[PDB]
mmCIF file with all atom_site columns, C-alpha atoms and ligand atoms in Angstrom:
data_model
loop_
_atom_site.group_PDB
_atom_site.id
_atom_site.type_symbol
_atom_site.label_atom_id
_atom_site.label_alt_id
_atom_site.label_comp_id
_atom_site.label_asym_id
_atom_site.label_entity_id
_atom_site.label_seq_id
_atom_site.pdbx_PDB_ins_code
_atom_site.Cartn_x
_atom_site.Cartn_y
_atom_site.Cartn_z
_atom_site.occupancy
_atom_site.B_iso_or_equiv
_atom_site.pdbx_formal_charge
_atom_site.auth_seq_id
_atom_site.auth_comp_id
_atom_site.auth_asym_id
_atom_site.auth_atom_id
_atom_site.pdbx_PDB_model_num
ATOM   1   C CA  . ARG X 1 1  ? -93.517  -67.184 31.819 1.00 40.07 ? 1   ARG X CA  1
ATOM   2   C CA  . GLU X 1 2  ? -92.518  -63.644 29.765 1.00 41.02 ? 2   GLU X CA  1
ATOM   3   C CA  . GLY X 1 3  ? -90.886  -60.839 31.915 1.00 43.79 ? 3   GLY X CA  1
ATOM   4   C CA  . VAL X 1 4  ? -88.532  -60.665 35.311 1.00 43.68 ? 4   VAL X CA  1
ATOM   5   C CA  . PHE X 1 5  ? -89.011  -60.301 39.203 1.00 44.48 ? 5   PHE X CA  1
ATOM   6   C CA  . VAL X 1 6  ? -88.484  -57.196 41.149 1.00 44.66 ? 6   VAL X CA  1
ATOM   7   C CA  . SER X 1 7  ? -88.980  -55.932 43.838 1.00 44.05 ? 7   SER X CA  1
ATOM   8   C CA  . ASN X 1 8  ? -90.031  -52.389 45.299 1.00 46.29 ? 8   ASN X CA  1
ATOM   9   C CA  . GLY X 1 9  ? -88.335  -52.813 48.526 1.00 45.56 ? 9   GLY X CA  1
ATOM   10  C CA  . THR X 1 10 ? -91.251  -54.311 50.597 1.00 49.30 ? 10  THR X CA  1
ATOM   11  C CA  . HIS X 1 11 ? -93.514  -56.200 47.649 1.00 48.72 ? 11  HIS X CA  1
ATOM   12  C CA  . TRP X 1 12 ? -92.968  -58.388 44.526 1.00 51.41 ? 12  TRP X CA  1
ATOM   13  C CA  . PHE X 1 13 ? -94.306  -58.478 41.128 1.00 51.47 ? 13  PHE X CA  1
ATOM   14  C CA  . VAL X 1 14 ? -93.403  -59.265 37.516 1.00 51.89 ? 14  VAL X CA  1
ATOM   15  C CA  . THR X 1 15 ? -92.677  -56.957 34.863 1.00 54.79 ? 15  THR X CA  1
ATOM   16  C CA  . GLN X 1 16 ? -92.126  -56.858 31.316 1.00 52.93 ? 16  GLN X CA  1
ATOM   17  C CA  . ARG X 1 17 ? -87.810  -56.407 30.344 1.00 51.21 ? 17  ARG X CA  1
ATOM   18  C CA  . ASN X 1 18 ? -88.223  -52.699 28.765 1.00 50.29 ? 18  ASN X CA  1
ATOM   19  C CA  . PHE X 1 19 ? -90.425  -50.557 30.509 1.00 50.98 ? 19  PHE X CA  1
ATOM   20  C CA  . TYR X 1 20 ? -92.333  -51.059 34.185 1.00 50.16 ? 20  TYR X CA  1
ATOM   21  C CA  . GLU X 1 21 ? -94.882  -52.480 34.689 1.00 51.87 ? 21  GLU X CA  1
ATOM   22  C CA  . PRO X 1 22 ? -95.176  -54.150 37.791 1.00 48.53 ? 22  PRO X CA  1
ATOM   23  C CA  . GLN X 1 23 ? -97.745  -57.108 37.943 1.00 49.67 ? 23  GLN X CA  1
ATOM   24  C CA  . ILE X 1 24 ? -99.534  -59.080 40.959 1.00 49.50 ? 24  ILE X CA  1
ATOM   25  C CA  . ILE X 1 25 ? -97.467  -62.519 40.912 1.00 52.74 ? 25  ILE X CA  1
ATOM   26  C CA  . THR X 1 26 ? -99.841  -65.289 39.964 1.00 51.63 ? 26  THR X CA  1
ATOM   27  C CA  . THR X 1 27 ? -100.092 -68.952 38.513 1.00 53.78 ? 27  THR X CA  1
ATOM   28  C CA  . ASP X 1 28 ? -100.989 -66.730 35.277 1.00 50.86 ? 28  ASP X CA  1
ATOM   29  C CA  . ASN X 1 29 ? -97.858  -65.045 35.470 1.00 50.67 ? 29  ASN X CA  1
ATOM   30  C CA  . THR X 1 30 ? -95.166  -67.368 36.133 1.00 51.27 ? 30  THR X CA  1
ATOM   31  C CA  . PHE X 1 31 ? -95.187  -71.463 35.242 1.00 51.87 ? 31  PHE X CA  1
ATOM   32  C CA  . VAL X 1 32 ? -92.796  -73.684 38.452 1.00 50.15 ? 32  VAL X CA  1
ATOM   33  C CA  . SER X 1 33 ? -90.427  -75.883 37.642 1.00 50.85 ? 33  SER X CA  1
ATOM   34  C CA  . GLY X 1 34 ? -88.838  -78.852 40.369 1.00 50.89 ? 34  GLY X CA  1
ATOM   35  C CA  . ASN X 1 35 ? -88.118  -77.510 44.227 1.00 49.47 ? 35  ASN X CA  1
ATOM   36  C CA  . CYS X 1 36 ? -86.766  -74.709 45.808 1.00 49.68 ? 36  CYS X CA  1
ATOM   37  C CA  . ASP X 1 37 ? -83.498  -76.892 46.849 1.00 48.98 ? 37  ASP X CA  1
ATOM   38  C CA  . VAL X 1 38 ? -81.218  -76.265 43.395 1.00 47.95 ? 38  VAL X CA  1
ATOM   39  C CA  . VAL X 1 39 ? -82.180  -72.307 42.243 1.00 49.66 ? 39  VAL X CA  1
ATOM   40  C CA  . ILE X 1 40 ? -79.025  -70.218 43.361 1.00 50.40 ? 40  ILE X CA  1
ATOM   41  C CA  . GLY X 1 41 ? -80.151  -66.855 44.055 1.00 49.25 ? 41  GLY X CA  1
ATOM   42  C CA  . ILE X 1 42 ? -84.784  -68.015 45.136 1.00 49.50 ? 42  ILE X CA  1
ATOM   43  C CA  . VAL X 1 43 ? -86.381  -66.021 47.133 1.00 49.35 ? 43  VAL X CA  1
ATOM   44  C CA  . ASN X 1 44 ? -89.599  -66.697 49.091 1.00 47.57 ? 44  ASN X CA  1
ATOM   45  C CA  . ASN X 1 45 ? -92.763  -64.342 48.038 1.00 47.24 ? 45  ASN X CA  1
ATOM   46  C CA  . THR X 1 46 ? -96.771  -65.952 47.737 1.00 50.73 ? 46  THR X CA  1
ATOM   47  C CA  . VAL X 1 47 ? -97.787  -66.664 44.210 1.00 54.90 ? 47  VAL X CA  1
ATOM   48  C CA  . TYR X 1 48 ? -100.910 -65.528 44.153 1.00 58.26 ? 48  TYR X CA  1
ATOM   49  C CA  . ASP X 1 49 ? -103.556 -68.661 42.268 1.00 57.95 ? 49  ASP X CA  1
ATOM   50  C CA  . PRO X 1 50 ? -106.410 -66.512 41.068 1.00 58.36 ? 50  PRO X CA  1
ATOM   51  C CA  . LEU X 1 51 ? -109.419 -69.146 40.877 1.00 57.12 ? 51  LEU X CA  1
ATOM   52  C CA  . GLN X 1 52 ? -109.367 -70.421 44.462 1.00 57.53 ? 52  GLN X CA  1
ATOM   53  C CA  . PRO X 1 53 ? -111.264 -66.405 45.634 1.00 56.97 ? 53  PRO X CA  1
ATOM   54  C CA  . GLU X 1 54 ? -113.938 -68.113 43.007 1.00 55.34 ? 54  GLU X CA  1
ATOM   55  C CA  . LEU X 1 55 ? -114.050 -71.476 43.601 1.00 54.66 ? 55  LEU X CA  1
ATOM   56  C CA  . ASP X 1 56 ? -114.888 -69.581 47.844 1.00 55.58 ? 56  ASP X CA  1
ATOM   57  C CA  . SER X 1 57 ? -117.616 -67.836 46.610 1.00 56.98 ? 57  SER X CA  1
ATOM   58  C CA  . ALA F 2 1  ? -76.346  -50.104 29.920 1.00 58.29 ? 1   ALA F CA  1
ATOM   59  C CA  . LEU F 2 2  ? -78.897  -51.444 32.671 1.00 57.98 ? 2   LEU F CA  1
ATOM   60  C CA  . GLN F 2 3  ? -77.225  -53.505 35.707 1.00 56.32 ? 3   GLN F CA  1
ATOM   61  C CA  . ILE F 2 4  ? -78.638  -57.384 35.484 1.00 62.97 ? 4   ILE F CA  1
ATOM   62  C CA  . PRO F 2 5  ? -77.452  -60.441 37.249 1.00 65.31 ? 5   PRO F CA  1
ATOM   63  C CA  . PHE F 2 6  ? -75.115  -62.716 34.876 1.00 66.53 ? 6   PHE F CA  1
ATOM   64  C CA  . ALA F 2 7  ? -77.043  -65.743 36.258 1.00 67.48 ? 7   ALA F CA  1
ATOM   65  C CA  . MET F 2 8  ? -80.871  -63.727 34.859 1.00 71.04 ? 8   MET F CA  1
ATOM   66  C CA  . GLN F 2 9  ? -79.058  -63.173 31.552 1.00 69.18 ? 9   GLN F CA  1
ATOM   67  C CA  . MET F 2 10 ? -78.374  -65.952 30.634 1.00 70.69 ? 10  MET F CA  1
ATOM   68  C CA  . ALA F 2 11 ? -81.734  -67.241 31.464 1.00 73.22 ? 11  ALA F CA  1
ATOM   69  C CA  . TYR F 2 12 ? -83.281  -64.656 28.411 1.00 73.38 ? 12  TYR F CA  1
ATOM   70  C CA  . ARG F 2 13 ? -80.080  -66.113 26.203 1.00 74.22 ? 13  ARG F CA  1
ATOM   71  C CA  . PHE F 2 14 ? -81.919  -69.781 26.680 1.00 74.16 ? 14  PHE F CA  1
ATOM   72  C CA  . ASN F 2 15 ? -85.237  -67.986 26.127 1.00 71.85 ? 15  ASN F CA  1
ATOM   73  C CA  . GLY F 2 16 ? -84.110  -66.027 23.512 1.00 73.97 ? 16  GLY F CA  1
ATOM   74  C CA  . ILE F 2 17 ? -83.279  -69.607 21.662 1.00 74.75 ? 17  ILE F CA  1
ATOM   75  C CA  . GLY F 2 18 ? -86.336  -71.703 22.566 1.00 75.31 ? 18  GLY F CA  1
ATOM   76  C CA  . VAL F 2 19 ? -85.046  -73.380 25.768 1.00 75.71 ? 19  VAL F CA  1
ATOM   77  C CA  . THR F 2 20 ? -87.962  -72.530 28.693 1.00 74.33 ? 20  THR F CA  1
ATOM   78  C CA  . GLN F 2 21 ? -85.100  -70.685 31.525 1.00 75.86 ? 21  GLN F CA  1
ATOM   79  C CA  . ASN F 2 22 ? -86.401  -73.254 34.256 1.00 75.36 ? 22  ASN F CA  1
ATOM   80  C CA  . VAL F 2 23 ? -83.264  -75.619 31.831 1.00 72.40 ? 23  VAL F CA  1
ATOM   81  C CA  . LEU F 2 24 ? -80.099  -72.268 33.034 1.00 74.41 ? 24  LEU F CA  1
ATOM   82  C CA  . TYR F 2 25 ? -81.677  -72.466 36.874 1.00 77.00 ? 25  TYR F CA  1
ATOM   83  C CA  . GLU F 2 26 ? -81.842  -76.469 37.352 1.00 74.74 ? 26  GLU F CA  1
ATOM   84  C CA  . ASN F 2 27 ? -78.069  -76.521 35.466 1.00 76.89 ? 27  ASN F CA  1
ATOM   85  C CA  . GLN F 2 28 ? -76.472  -73.352 36.882 1.00 75.11 ? 28  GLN F CA  1
ATOM   86  C CA  . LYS F 2 29 ? -73.420  -75.261 38.053 1.00 77.30 ? 29  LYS F CA  1
ATOM   87  C CA  . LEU F 2 30 ? -73.166  -77.212 35.455 1.00 78.02 ? 30  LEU F CA  1
ATOM   88  C CA  . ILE F 2 31 ? -73.426  -74.441 32.515 1.00 76.68 ? 31  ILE F CA  1
ATOM   89  C CA  . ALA F 2 32 ? -71.195  -72.385 34.347 1.00 75.58 ? 32  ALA F CA  1
ATOM   90  C CA  . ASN F 2 33 ? -68.798  -75.058 34.725 1.00 75.37 ? 33  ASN F CA  1
ATOM   91  C CA  . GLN F 2 34 ? -69.213  -76.158 31.321 1.00 70.44 ? 34  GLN F CA  1
ATOM   92  C CA  . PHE F 2 35 ? -68.124  -72.543 30.640 1.00 67.57 ? 35  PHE F CA  1
ATOM   93  C CA  . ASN F 2 36 ? -65.676  -71.836 32.262 1.00 68.04 ? 36  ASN F CA  1
ATOM   94  C CA  . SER F 2 37 ? -63.637  -75.326 31.361 1.00 67.48 ? 37  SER F CA  1
ATOM   95  C CA  . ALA F 2 38 ? -64.338  -74.087 27.109 1.00 66.40 ? 38  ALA F CA  1
ATOM   96  C CA  . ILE F 2 39 ? -62.672  -70.615 28.021 1.00 64.03 ? 39  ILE F CA  1
ATOM   97  C CA  . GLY F 2 40 ? -59.421  -73.502 29.622 1.00 64.13 ? 40  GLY F CA  1
ATOM   98  C CA  . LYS F 2 41 ? -59.932  -74.591 26.305 1.00 65.00 ? 41  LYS F CA  1
ATOM   99  C CA  . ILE F 2 42 ? -59.661  -71.378 24.163 1.00 65.14 ? 42  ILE F CA  1
ATOM   100 C CA  . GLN F 2 43 ? -56.508  -70.563 25.987 1.00 64.51 ? 43  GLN F CA  1
ATOM   101 C CA  . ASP F 2 44 ? -54.584  -74.018 26.031 1.00 65.54 ? 44  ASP F CA  1
ATOM   102 C CA  . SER F 2 45 ? -55.593  -74.131 22.251 1.00 64.49 ? 45  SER F CA  1
ATOM   103 C CA  . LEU F 2 46 ? -53.951  -70.395 21.326 1.00 62.84 ? 46  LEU F CA  1
ATOM   104 C CA  . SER F 2 47 ? -51.651  -71.191 23.080 1.00 62.92 ? 47  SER F CA  1
ATOM   105 C CA  . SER F 2 48 ? -49.719  -73.918 21.172 1.00 63.00 ? 48  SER F CA  1
ATOM   106 C CA  . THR F 2 49 ? -51.644  -73.865 18.185 1.00 63.38 ? 49  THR F CA  1
ATOM   107 C CA  . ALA F 2 50 ? -49.315  -70.761 15.899 1.00 64.56 ? 50  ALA F CA  1
HETATM 108 C C1  . LIG G 3 .  ? -94.404  -51.569 47.150 1.00 62.30 ? 101 LIG G C1  1
HETATM 109 O O1  . LIG G 3 .  ? -95.295  -51.677 46.615 1.00 62.30 ? 101 LIG G O1  1
HETATM 110 C C2  . LIG G 3 .  ? -97.003  -52.371 46.965 1.00 62.30 ? 101 LIG G C2  1
HETATM 111 C C3  . LIG G 3 .  ? -98.455  -51.504 46.680 1.00 62.30 ? 101 LIG G C3  1
HETATM 112 O O2  . LIG G 3 .  ? -98.033  -50.720 44.948 1.00 62.30 ? 101 LIG G O2  1
HETATM 113 C C4  . LIG G 3 .  ? -97.124  -50.859 47.959 1.00 62.30 ? 101 LIG G C4  1
HETATM 114 O O3  . LIG G 3 .  ? -98.143  -50.615 49.324 1.00 62.30 ? 101 LIG G O3  1
HETATM 115 C C5  . LIG G 3 .  ? -99.673  -50.358 49.277 1.00 62.30 ? 101 LIG G C5  1
HETATM 116 O O4  . LIG G 3 .  ? -98.663  -49.023 49.196 1.00 62.30 ? 101 LIG G O4  1
HETATM 117 C C6  . LIG G 3 .  ? -100.415 -47.929 49.419 1.00 62.30 ? 101 LIG G C6  1
HETATM 118 C C7  . LIG G 3 .  ? -100.303 -46.951 50.023 1.00 62.30 ? 101 LIG G C7  1
HETATM 119 O O5  . LIG G 3 .  ? -98.235  -45.898 49.181 1.00 62.30 ? 101 LIG G O5  1
HETATM 120 C C8  . LIG G 3 .  ? -101.283 -48.968 50.229 1.00 62.30 ? 101 LIG G C8  1
HETATM 121 O O6  . LIG G 3 .  ? -102.190 -47.574 50.006 1.00 62.30 ? 101 LIG G O6  1
HETATM 122 C C9  . LIG G 3 .  ? -101.892 -49.543 49.812 1.00 62.30 ? 101 LIG G C9  1
HETATM 123 O O7  . LIG G 3 .  ? -102.634 -50.766 51.409 1.00 62.30 ? 101 LIG G O7  1
HETATM 124 C C10 . LIG G 3 .  ? -100.409 -50.841 49.923 1.00 62.30 ? 101 LIG G C10 1
HETATM 125 N N1  . LIG G 3 .  ? -101.090 -51.964 49.828 1.00 62.30 ? 101 LIG G N1  1
HETATM 126 C C11 . LIG G 3 .  ? -99.937  -53.321 49.639 1.00 62.30 ? 101 LIG G C11 1
HETATM 127 C C12 . LIG G 3 .  ? -100.439 -54.730 49.187 1.00 62.30 ? 101 LIG G C12 1
HETATM 128 O O8  . LIG G 3 .  ? -99.721  -53.070 50.977 1.00 62.30 ? 101 LIG G O8  1
HETATM 129 C C13 . LIG G 3 .  ? -96.126  -50.510 48.939 1.00 62.30 ? 101 LIG G C13 1
HETATM 130 O O9  . LIG G 3 .  ? -95.755  -48.964 50.101 1.00 62.30 ? 101 LIG G O9  1
HETATM 131 C C14 . LIG G 3 .  ? -94.689  -49.993 48.142 1.00 62.30 ? 101 LIG G C14 1
HETATM 132 N N2  . LIG G 3 .  ? -93.086  -49.845 48.555 1.00 62.30 ? 101 LIG G N2  1
HETATM 133 C C15 . LIG G 3 .  ? -92.100  -48.890 48.510 1.00 62.30 ? 101 LIG G C15 1
HETATM 134 C C16 . LIG G 3 .  ? -91.437  -48.767 49.064 1.00 62.30 ? 101 LIG G C16 1
HETATM 135 O O10 . LIG G 3 .  ? -92.143  -48.006 47.624 1.00 62.30 ? 101 LIG G O10 1
HETATM 136 C C1  . LIG G 3 .  ? -88.005  -69.583 52.738 1.00 62.23 ? 102 LIG G C1  1
HETATM 137 O O1  . LIG G 3 .  ? -89.360  -70.413 54.025 1.00 62.23 ? 102 LIG G O1  1
HETATM 138 C C2  . LIG G 3 .  ? -88.853  -71.985 54.496 1.00 62.23 ? 102 LIG G C2  1
HETATM 139 C C3  . LIG G 3 .  ? -89.972  -72.305 55.446 1.00 62.23 ? 102 LIG G C3  1
HETATM 140 O O2  . LIG G 3 .  ? -90.662  -72.103 54.304 1.00 62.23 ? 102 LIG G O2  1
HETATM 141 C C4  . LIG G 3 .  ? -87.595  -71.198 54.945 1.00 62.23 ? 102 LIG G C4  1
HETATM 142 O O3  . LIG G 3 .  ? -87.227  -72.769 55.224 1.00 62.23 ? 102 LIG G O3  1
HETATM 143 C C5  . LIG G 3 .  ? -86.766  -72.757 57.204 1.00 62.23 ? 102 LIG G C5  1
HETATM 144 O O4  . LIG G 3 .  ? -85.554  -72.726 57.138 1.00 62.23 ? 102 LIG G O4  1
HETATM 145 C C6  . LIG G 3 .  ? -84.821  -73.172 58.086 1.00 62.23 ? 102 LIG G C6  1
HETATM 146 C C7  . LIG G 3 .  ? -83.172  -72.455 58.368 1.00 62.23 ? 102 LIG G C7  1
HETATM 147 O O5  . LIG G 3 .  ? -82.729  -73.444 57.452 1.00 62.23 ? 102 LIG G O5  1
HETATM 148 C C8  . LIG G 3 .  ? -85.649  -74.329 59.254 1.00 62.23 ? 102 LIG G C8  1
HETATM 149 O O6  . LIG G 3 .  ? -85.004  -74.256 60.376 1.00 62.23 ? 102 LIG G O6  1
HETATM 150 C C9  . LIG G 3 .  ? -86.051  -74.842 59.305 1.00 62.23 ? 102 LIG G C9  1
HETATM 151 O O7  . LIG G 3 .  ? -86.829  -76.254 59.416 1.00 62.23 ? 102 LIG G O7  1
HETATM 152 C C10 . LIG G 3 .  ? -87.230  -74.772 56.943 1.00 62.23 ? 102 LIG G C10 1
HETATM 153 N N1  . LIG G 3 .  ? -88.273  -74.552 57.224 1.00 62.23 ? 102 LIG G N1  1
HETATM 154 C C11 . LIG G 3 .  ? -88.367  -75.586 55.416 1.00 62.23 ? 102 LIG G C11 1
HETATM 155 C C12 . LIG G 3 .  ? -90.426  -76.099 55.427 1.00 62.23 ? 102 LIG G C12 1
HETATM 156 O O8  . LIG G 3 .  ? -87.866  -75.800 55.220 1.00 62.23 ? 102 LIG G O8  1
HETATM 157 C C13 . LIG G 3 .  ? -86.550  -70.984 54.126 1.00 62.23 ? 102 LIG G C13 1
HETATM 158 O O9  . LIG G 3 .  ? -85.073  -70.667 54.803 1.00 62.23 ? 102 LIG G O9  1
HETATM 159 C C14 . LIG G 3 .  ? -87.098  -69.722 53.161 1.00 62.23 ? 102 LIG G C14 1
HETATM 160 N N2  . LIG G 3 .  ? -85.636  -69.453 51.981 1.00 62.23 ? 102 LIG G N2  1
HETATM 161 C C15 . LIG G 3 .  ? -84.984  -68.655 52.469 1.00 62.23 ? 102 LIG G C15 1
HETATM 162 C C16 . LIG G 3 .  ? -84.211  -67.987 51.013 1.00 62.23 ? 102 LIG G C16 1
HETATM 163 O O10 . LIG G 3 .  ? -85.799  -67.252 53.156 1.00 62.23 ? 102 LIG G O10 1
HETATM 164 C C1  . LIG G 3 .  ? -74.929  -83.244 30.080 1.00 63.40 ? 103 LIG G C1  1
HETATM 165 O O1  . LIG G 3 .  ? -73.372  -83.180 30.135 1.00 63.40 ? 103 LIG G O1  1
HETATM 166 C C2  . LIG G 3 .  ? -72.444  -82.751 31.457 1.00 63.40 ? 103 LIG G C2  1
HETATM 167 C C3  . LIG G 3 .  ? -71.672  -82.954 29.926 1.00 63.40 ? 103 LIG G C3  1
HETATM 168 O O2  . LIG G 3 .  ? -70.880  -82.283 29.920 1.00 63.40 ? 103 LIG G O2  1
HETATM 169 C C4  . LIG G 3 .  ? -72.777  -84.167 31.621 1.00 63.40 ? 103 LIG G C4  1
HETATM 170 O O3  . LIG G 3 .  ? -71.492  -83.351 33.703 1.00 63.40 ? 103 LIG G O3  1
HETATM 171 C C5  . LIG G 3 .  ? -70.357  -84.742 33.561 1.00 63.40 ? 103 LIG G C5  1
HETATM 172 O O4  . LIG G 3 .  ? -70.881  -85.247 34.594 1.00 63.40 ? 103 LIG G O4  1
HETATM 173 C C6  . LIG G 3 .  ? -69.818  -87.119 34.710 1.00 63.40 ? 103 LIG G C6  1
HETATM 174 C C7  . LIG G 3 .  ? -70.675  -87.635 35.664 1.00 63.40 ? 103 LIG G C7  1
HETATM 175 O O5  . LIG G 3 .  ? -71.896  -88.012 34.960 1.00 63.40 ? 103 LIG G O5  1
HETATM 176 C C8  . LIG G 3 .  ? -68.494  -86.071 35.831 1.00 63.40 ? 103 LIG G C8  1
HETATM 177 O O6  . LIG G 3 .  ? -67.266  -86.858 35.482 1.00 63.40 ? 103 LIG G O6  1
HETATM 178 C C9  . LIG G 3 .  ? -68.309  -85.068 34.426 1.00 63.40 ? 103 LIG G C9  1
HETATM 179 O O7  . LIG G 3 .  ? -67.359  -84.673 35.418 1.00 63.40 ? 103 LIG G O7  1
HETATM 180 C C10 . LIG G 3 .  ? -68.700  -84.452 34.159 1.00 63.40 ? 103 LIG G C10 1
HETATM 181 N N1  . LIG G 3 .  ? -69.214  -82.904 33.274 1.00 63.40 ? 103 LIG G N1  1
HETATM 182 C C11 . LIG G 3 .  ? -69.254  -81.948 34.133 1.00 63.40 ? 103 LIG G C11 1
HETATM 183 C C12 . LIG G 3 .  ? -68.411  -80.592 33.231 1.00 63.40 ? 103 LIG G C12 1
HETATM 184 O O8  . LIG G 3 .  ? -70.157  -81.116 34.866 1.00 63.40 ? 103 LIG G O8  1
HETATM 185 C C13 . LIG G 3 .  ? -73.492  -83.548 32.967 1.00 63.40 ? 103 LIG G C13 1
HETATM 186 O O9  . LIG G 3 .  ? -73.787  -85.433 33.677 1.00 63.40 ? 103 LIG G O9  1
HETATM 187 C C14 . LIG G 3 .  ? -75.110  -85.008 31.490 1.00 63.40 ? 103 LIG G C14 1
HETATM 188 N N2  . LIG G 3 .  ? -76.402  -85.251 32.220 1.00 63.40 ? 103 LIG G N2  1
HETATM 189 C C15 . LIG G 3 .  ? -77.059  -85.898 31.981 1.00 63.40 ? 103 LIG G C15 1
HETATM 190 C C16 . LIG G 3 .  ? -78.887  -85.918 33.081 1.00 63.40 ? 103 LIG G C16 1
HETATM 191 O O10 . LIG G 3 .  ? -76.808  -86.198 30.891 1.00 63.40 ? 103 LIG G O10 1
HETATM 192 C C1  . NAG G 4 .  ? -74.108  -60.969 46.376 1.00 66.44 ? 104 NAG G C1  1
HETATM 193 O O1  . NAG G 4 .  ? -72.882  -60.936 47.066 1.00 66.44 ? 104 NAG G O1  1
HETATM 194 C C2  . NAG G 4 .  ? -72.214  -61.219 48.345 1.00 66.44 ? 104 NAG G C2  1
HETATM 195 C C3  . NAG G 4 .  ? -71.201  -61.068 47.842 1.00 66.44 ? 104 NAG G C3  1
HETATM 196 O O2  . NAG G 4 .  ? -70.894  -61.826 45.927 1.00 66.44 ? 104 NAG G O2  1
HETATM 197 C C4  . NAG G 4 .  ? -73.045  -62.328 48.858 1.00 66.44 ? 104 NAG G C4  1
HETATM 198 O O3  . NAG G 4 .  ? -73.026  -62.393 49.827 1.00 66.44 ? 104 NAG G O3  1
HETATM 199 C C5  . NAG G 4 .  ? -74.801  -62.968 48.233 1.00 66.44 ? 104 NAG G C5  1
HETATM 200 O O4  . NAG G 4 .  ? -74.789  -64.155 49.515 1.00 66.44 ? 104 NAG G O4  1
HETATM 201 C C6  . NAG G 4 .  ? -74.073  -62.551 47.105 1.00 66.44 ? 104 NAG G C6  1
HETATM 202 N N1  . NAG G 4 .  ? -75.936  -63.229 47.005 1.00 66.44 ? 104 NAG G N1  1
HETATM 203 C C7  . NAG G 4 .  ? -76.214  -64.505 45.884 1.00 66.44 ? 104 NAG G C7  1
HETATM 204 C C8  . NAG G 4 .  ? -77.802  -64.520 45.617 1.00 66.44 ? 104 NAG G C8  1
HETATM 205 O O5  . NAG G 4 .  ? -75.484  -64.862 45.481 1.00 66.44 ? 104 NAG G O5  1
#
């Protein structure tokens, strides 16, 4: 939504463009569009959905 | 200078005009071809038009 994806080598994070602040990738930090096939250089990682552990209680 | 991939710099340029950056990635080959062709037209324009 704002910022850019980065990896420390082992894990994937989203970060604001002008200061390194690594945050977990979530359905709040990110928006969907279309599917994997169209994007040049897309990568595979989990996106954590913050609602699911709440409803898992 | 901080390096950034050019297809990712252009996504920042698209957000800078209020076009959501998925519009670049979904059209990256088209946007690249329109840019390459437009630089083509500059050479033809300048080469002919004194
Ligand atoms: C990349 O970031 C992750 C998360 O900050 C690091 O994984 C953690 O590493 C510490 C030890 O350094 C462990 O105590 C945590 O349990 C780890 N968390 C997870 C979710 O695995 C990871 O080590 C970092 N990698 C690099 C190369 O810096
Ligand atoms: C991202 O993950 C998907 C699976 O979730 C990978 O898709 C598989 O790719 C291989 C090789 O083309 C196929 O044999 C499988 O049948 C594919 N599975 C599915 C469900 O499509 C994909 O290759 C991964 N992409 C990257 C860039 O790592
Ligand atoms: C958006 O506009 C471009 C033209 O700039 C369209 O791309 C052309 O599509 C036709 C076939 O429909 C081709 O003959 C041209 O060679 C294409 N031009 C380029 C530069 O690739 C594009 O199809 C349009 N898209 C939509 C959804 O209207
Ligand atoms: C990045 O660099 C090399 C040379 O262009 C190429 O082999 C590799 O596939 C490229 N990856 C992407 C995602 O374009």
